[PDB]
Each structure stands twice: as C-alpha cells, then as structure tokens.
C-alpha cells in the first residue's frame, strides 16, 4: 500500500461524499417528525460545605450545604485551589 | 450613539396570520390600531392582540442563528441583525427545539452535536457568596446513601 495517490484520492472522495450529503439534507423540504451519561465526575462523588455564621443578637449557627452538581463543583474548587496558591 | 436594532420573529395562529398578512400587504395605518404587542415583566410572556382579540404569547429561543440580510441590487447582501428569538402566539419551556425552515426540525435533538449549551456557573457564584458566610466547612466524597 502507499499514501501518494491512495491518501489523496480517499480524502477527495470523502470530501465529495460529505458535500453531496450536506447539500441534500439542507435543501430537503421534507417535514421532520418531532447520548452517553457522565457520572457525577470521574471520582463519582459530590461536594459538601458545612459552615458557621453569627445571627442577630448572639448566636453561632452552622450550615452544611451539599452540592451534587459536578459543574458547580469544578468551578467552586478551581477558585479555592487558585486562592490557595494566590497567597 | 447608534444602538443595534433588535429583530425577532412573530408567529401567529394561521387565521390570525392571514388577517395580519392581508393588513400588512394593504399598507394603511389601520393595521397599527389592529395589531398591538404587550410584553410582560416576566420577559418570556406576552399578549399579541390581533383586531383587539388577545392571544397568549411566549418568547422562545431558537436553536439556530438567523441573520437578516438587506440588498439594493440582489447581488450583494449586507447583514443587518441577528435573530434568535420568536414570539410564538396561540427555562426549558422557553427553548424551541425546531428551526424555522422545513429541513430543520428537531435540529436541537438530531442535527446538533451535544458538546453543551449552558446556569451551572451562576449557581457557582451563589455558592461562593454563601461560602463566604463560613469559618469551618466539612466536605466528604460520598457513596450510595
């Protein structure tokens, strides 16, 4: 086998086929009729945030909040890791 | 200064669309009294009133991006605005899955690569704001419980 004419011709024909395929689908006036699920991250876990604030008068309540959204997790942690290095 | 014009598409029920089309192609200011648009402070709800008959409206987001293109000679076309919203008359509900043209239907479900759309980061900002109400936090990678 080689790649002087074989590679070039293969690329050319795939190009004509995709060009032909897109023209047809796009110009179609046919009516149309009305994915892998990722785990809660690679590590498959959640982020929890217990806390501590002072209420009016005198009080010391602590709030534990759990974030199960792996998107919120990533953005949250990235700031701490940055602020941990920001010192 | 100049502010970019904001064009959107208005979709009406078919009989009301025929009356509005006849009144537009007629061209009198009689249409101005007949057709009104009231947009509610939700931002995604409205009334379109055709001939003083109220219709319920929703401003939805379109899956593709349209662009209005004007011309003077029909050979060179100048882009005037970007259209991404439609006030159909009769959140997840405010997202339209289909496109305006006939070949584009269920485009969002079938002809769109599922890299992502958007929400997660506004929630992150809220979480950081709450975090700054803390002196001690406890976090544990967890399992089924």
UniProtKB/Swiss-Prot annotation, chain A:
Modification comment: Phosphorylated by casein kinase II in vitro.
Compartment(s) where it occurs, according to its Swiss-Prot or TrEMBL record: Nucleus
Effect in UniProt of substituting residue 51 to C: Found in a patient with X-linked intellectual disability; uncertain significance
Functional description taken from the UniProt entry: The TFIID basal transcription factor complex plays a major role in the initiation of RNA polymerase II (Pol II)-dependent transcription. TFIID recognizes and binds promoters with or without a TATA box via its subunit TBP, a TATA-box-binding protein, and promotes assembly of the pre-initiation complex (PIC). The TFIID complex consists of TBP and TBP-associated factors (TAFs), including TAF1, TAF2, TAF3, TAF4, TAF5, TAF6, TAF7, TAF8, TAF9, TAF10, TAF11, TAF12 and TAF13. TAF1 is the largest component and core scaffold of the TFIID complex, involved in nucleating complex assembly.
Associated pathology: Dystonia 3, torsion, X-linked: An X-linked dystonia-parkinsonism disorder. Dystonia is defined by the presence of sustained involuntary muscle contractions, often leading to abnormal postures. DYT3 is characterized by severe progressive torsion dystonia followed by parkinsonism. It has a well-defined pathology of extensive neuronal loss and mosaic gliosis in the striatum (caudate nucleus and putamen) which appears to resemble that in Huntington disease. Intellectual developmental disorder, X-linked, syndromic 33: A syndrome characterized by intellectual deficit, delayed psychomotor development, delayed speech and language, and characteristic facial features.
Entry similarity comment: Belongs to the TAF1 family.
Domain comment quoted from the record: The Bromo domain mediates interaction with histones that have acetylated lysine residues at specific positions. The second domain also recognizes and binds histones that are butyrylated and crotonylated.
Subunit structure: Component of the TFIID basal transcription factor complex, composed of TATA-box-binding protein TBP, and a number of TBP-associated factors (TAFs), including TAF1, TAF2, TAF3, TAF4, TAF5, TAF6, TAF7, TAF8, TAF9, TAF10, TAF11, TAF12 and TAF13. Interacts with TAF7; the interaction is direct. TAF1, when part of the TFIID complex, interacts with C-terminus of TP53. (Microbial infection) Interacts with SV40 Large T antigen.
UniProt name for this protein: Transcription initiation factor TFIID subunit 1
The organism of origin for this protein: Homo sapiens
Swiss-Prot record, chain B:
Tissues/organs with expression: Ubiquitous.
Subcellular location: Nucleus
PTM summary: Phosphorylated by CIITA. Ubiquitinated by TRIM26; leading to proteasomal degradation.
Modified residues annotated as Phosphoserine in this record: 129
UniProt subunit comment: Component of the TFIID basal transcription factor complex, composed of TATA-box-binding protein TBP, and a number of TBP-associated factors (TAFs), including TAF1, TAF2, TAF3, TAF4, TAF5, TAF6, TAF7, TAF8, TAF9, TAF10, TAF11, TAF12 and TAF13. Part of a TFIID-containing RNA polymerase II pre-initiation complex that is composed of TBP and at least GTF2A1, GTF2A2, GTF2E1, GTF2E2, GTF2F1, GTF2H2, GTF2H3, GTF2H4, GTF2H5, GTF2B, TCEA1, ERCC2, ERCC3, TAF1, TAF2, TAF3, TAF4, TAF5, TAF6, TAF7, TAF8, TAF9, TAF10, TAF11, TAF12 and TAF13. Interacts with TAF1; the interaction is direct.
Family note: Belongs to the TAF7 family.
Note, other: Overexpression of TAF7 in HeLa cells inhibits cyclin D1 and cyclin A gene transcription and causes the cells to accumulate in early S phase. In contrast, depletion of TAF7 from TFIID complexes by siRNAs increases histone H3 acetylation at both cyclin promoters and stimulates cyclins CCND1 and CCNA gene transcription.
Role noted for this protein: The TFIID basal transcription factor complex plays a major role in the initiation of RNA polymerase II (Pol II)-dependent transcription. TFIID recognizes and binds promoters with or without a TATA box via its subunit TBP, a TATA-box-binding protein, and promotes assembly of the pre-initiation complex (PIC). The TFIID complex consists of TBP and TBP-associated factors (TAFs), including TAF1, TAF2, TAF3, TAF4, TAF5, TAF6, TAF7, TAF8, TAF9, TAF10, TAF11, TAF12 and TAF13. TAF7 forms a promoter DNA binding subcomplex of TFIID, together with TAF1 and TAF2.
Protein name: Transcription initiation factor TFIID subunit 7
Natural source organism: Homo sapiens (Human)
Full-protein residues shown: 9 to 187 of 349
